């Protein structure tokens, strides 16, 4: 039901270096799908 705008632009020049910028972490394991407009921060081990 989203009323708003999405703005995106390429940033290869402040967020990337030769050894690799590793300050951006993208979580790929979670127990269940998130509610709308919700975050989880806690660092606990995910066993498959």
């Amino acid at each position, epitope marked *: 039901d989203f009323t708003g705008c999405v703005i995106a632009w390429n940033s290869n020049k402040l967020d990337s270096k030769h050894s690799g910028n590793y300050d951006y972490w993208y979580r*790929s394991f979670r127990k269940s799908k998130l509610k709308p407009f919700e975050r989880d921060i806690s660092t606990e081990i995910y066993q498959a």
Partner: nanobody
Amino acid sequence: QVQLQESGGGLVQPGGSLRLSCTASGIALHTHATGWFRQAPGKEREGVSCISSGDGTTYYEDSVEGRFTISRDNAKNTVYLQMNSLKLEDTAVYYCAADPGAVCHSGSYYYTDDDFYYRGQGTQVTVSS
């Protein structure tokens, strides 16, 4: 935290076979593109193969094409190499390494020199006993 240990190696003979295995103690496979590197003594480290993060996209080098192969299994969380038709000048210290995301042949960017973030201890492989 994330260590990449190797199992295999030893003394073999030309025309023989041997198996390499790299089990990731840290982050899993099928999410990081892993690769393999070798070091001839007195010579610089050059990679031999990769497998991508997604599916089974496979690359080799020119001098090792057809003879050697790569495969992985996600349940054991390891990558496997089958050495076939071993010859004299392959005597090298073999390393396994990894990097997040598909990095081997990614656009106009092949797996040139050493760009992976993780490193392994390495095992020795010798031939012609």
